[PDB]
């Protein structure tokens, strides 16, 4: 998107490998290297999910 080194930075998150990812917008603003949550890659379902990229 409109890449603006302004606390506005786009990122994703793997599925422990579940394989690929899924969309997400972000803001250093707070918690830098902070970013985790679960989902479900083509890999079965669910799976921890770091976001960092």
């Amino acid at each position: 998107a409109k890449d603006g080194p302004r606390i506005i930075v786009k990122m994703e998150s793997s599925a422990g490998t579940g394989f690929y990812y899924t969309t997400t917008k972000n803001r250093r603003n707070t918690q830098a290297k902070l970013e985790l949550k679960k989902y479900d890659p083509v890999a079965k379902k669910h799976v921890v999910f770091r976001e960092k990229k």
């Binding site: 998107a1 409109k2 786009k10 899924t22 969309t23 997400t24 917008k25």
Partner: protein
């Protein structure tokens, strides 16, 4: 002799015996659009009427 914006004929295009023609959804996606998900579920195929006449025609013949 004749041809056709072969183009559009390429991208978006192609008719059904019905005498009608369609090209893939075409909301936003595939450019800018961190946007959302469910919105994703927003790309199948969009069939515009009226104009699809220039189209079809201009293509006419092979497609």
């Amino acid at each position: 002799p004749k041809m056709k914006t072969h183009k559009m004929a390429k991208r978006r295009i192609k008719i059904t015996g019905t005498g009608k023609v369609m090209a893939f959804k075409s909301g936003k996606r595939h450019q800018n659009t961190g946007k959302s998900g469910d919105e994703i579920r927003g790309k199948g195929k969009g069939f515009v009427l009226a104009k699809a006449e220039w189209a079809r025609m201009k293509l006419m013949l092979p497609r």
